[PDB]
Design a binder for this molecule. Structure first.
Ligand SMILES: *CCC(=O)N1CC[C@@H](Oc2n[nH]c3ncc(-c4cn(-c5c(F)ccc(NS(=O)(=O)c6cccc(-c7ccccc7)c6)c5F)nn4)cc23)C1
Length: 291
C-alpha cells in the first residue's frame, strides 16, 4: 500500500458519473505519471492481498488515496482507451488476423494469470470489452478484476452487462472460473464482428434468451470454423464444458500455426459488408420475438 496524497493528483475528467466506482483520469504530480483513480466511499485494509498482483495484461496498481472523505485506488492509465471504444470505431478496420490473435492472447493470458498464477485466485465475474484497455504499445490490460470481491458498488447498468454474463452469473447460481471463459468468448466475437453484442435489445430479454433458449450471439456463416468452434466451447451452457484459459492459450497457439487460417480469417474480417446482415437479421428476429 503506497499512499498517494489527494493533493499529489491533478484530476482531468471523470468516466463514470461522479459516483462511487467512477474513474478519473489524472496526473500524479509527485511522479509525473498519467493515472486512473477510482472513487470509493472507503478502502478495505484487508484488500492488500490484491495490491501484489502484477502482469503485463492486467492494469497496474500504484497506490491508495486515504484522506477522508476522499478514498480512491490509483492505477496506470492506458493511453489508447478501452477495447470497447476501439472495436466500435472505424479504427477497428485496421484489424487483421495477427491483430485479433495478439489481442485475444493478451486477454487470455491476463485471465490465466488471475485464475492460476497470482498470490490469490481471482475470478473476475465482470470481464467485458469495456473492462479491457489498450496501453501505448497496443498491449491489452484487464481492469476491474478485484471489483466482484471487494468493491461490489462499482458494478451494480447491470442491464448493460447481460451480453457478457454467463448464464450461471445471471441466475446468481454457483459460479466457477469458467464464467470468465464465457465472457471472453463474447470479447472474441466482438473483435471478430466489431458489433455491439445483442445491440438494441432489452437486458431482461437477453438474460432470458441466453438462459432459457440457449441463445448465443450470431456467428457469421463465413467465419472460420476454428474461430466458430472456439466461440462455441466458450459459450457452453454447462460451465464444466468450457475451456480453461490455459487451454484457450494453447488453442490460439494451434490456430496461429495453421497456414490456411490467415487468408481465411482476413478474408472474413474484411468482408463485413456481406455478413453484417446475418447479425442484423437475428437482431430483428429477436426484437420482434417480444412484440
Ligand atoms: C467515459 C468513457 C469510457 O469508458 N472510457 C473513455 C476512455 C477509456 O478510459 C480509459 N482509457 N485508458 C484507461 N486505462 C485505465 C482505465 C481504468 C482503470 N480503472 C481502475 C481503477 F481506477 C481502480 C481499480 C481498477 N481495477 S481493480 O479494482 O480490479 C484493482 C486493480 C489493482 C489493484 C486493486 C486494489 C488494490 C488494493 C486494494 C483494493 C484493490 C484493484 C481499475 F480498473 N478503471 N478504468 C480506464 C482507461 C474508457
Amino acid at each position: 500500500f503506497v499512499q498517494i496524497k489527494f493533493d499529489d493528483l491533478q484530476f482531468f475528467e471523470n468516466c463514470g458519473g461522479g459516483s462511487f466506482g467512477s474513474v478519473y483520469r489524472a496526473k500524479w504530480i509527485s511522479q509525473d505519471k498519467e493515472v486512473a483513480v477510482k472513487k470509493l466511499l472507503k478502502i478495505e485494509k484487508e484488500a492488500e492481498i490484491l495490491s501484489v498482483l502484477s502482469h503485463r495484461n492486467i492494469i497496474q496498481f500504484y497506490g491508495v488515496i486515504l484522506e477522508p472523505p476522499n478514498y480512491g485506488i490509483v492505477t496506470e492509465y492506458a493511453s489508447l482507451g478501452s477495447l470497447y471504444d476501439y472495436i466500435n470505431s472505424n479504427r477497428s478496420e485496421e484489424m487483421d488476423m495477427d491483430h485479433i490473435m495478439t489481442w485475444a492472447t493478451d486477454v487470455a493470458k491476463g485471465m490465466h494469470y488471475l485464475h492460476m498464477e497470482a498470490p490469490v485466485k481471482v475470478i473476475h465475474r465482470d470481464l467485458k470489452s469495456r473492462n479491457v484497455v489498450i496501453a501505448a504499445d497496443g498491449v491489452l490490460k484487464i481492469c476491474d478484476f478485484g471489483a466482484s470481491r471487494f468493491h461490489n458498488h462499482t458494478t451494480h447498468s447491470l442491464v448493460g452487462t447481460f451480453p457478457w454474463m454467463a448464464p450461471e452469473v445471471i441466475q446468481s447460481l454457483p459460479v466457477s472460473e469458467t464464467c470468465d471463459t464465457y465472457s471472453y468468448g463474447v470479447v472474441l466475437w466482438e473483435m471478430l464482428t466489431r458489433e455491439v453484442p445483442f445491440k438494441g435489445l432489452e437486458g431482461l430479454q437477453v438474460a432470458w434468451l441466453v438462459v432459457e433458449k440457449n441463445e448465443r450471439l450470431t456467428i457469421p456463416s463465413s467465419c472460420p470454423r476454428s474461430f466458430a468452434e472456439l466461440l462455441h466451447q466458450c459459450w457452453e451452457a454447462d460451465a464444466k464444458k468450457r475451456p480453461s484459459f490455459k487451454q484457450i492459450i494453447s488453442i490460439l497457439e494451434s490456430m496461429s500455426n495453421d497456414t490456411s487460417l490467415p487468408d481465411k480469417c482476413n478474408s472474413f474480417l474484411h468482408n463485413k459488408a456481406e455478413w453484417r446482415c446475418e447479425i442484423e437479421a437475428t437482431l430483428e428476429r429477436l426484437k420482434k420475438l417480444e412484440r
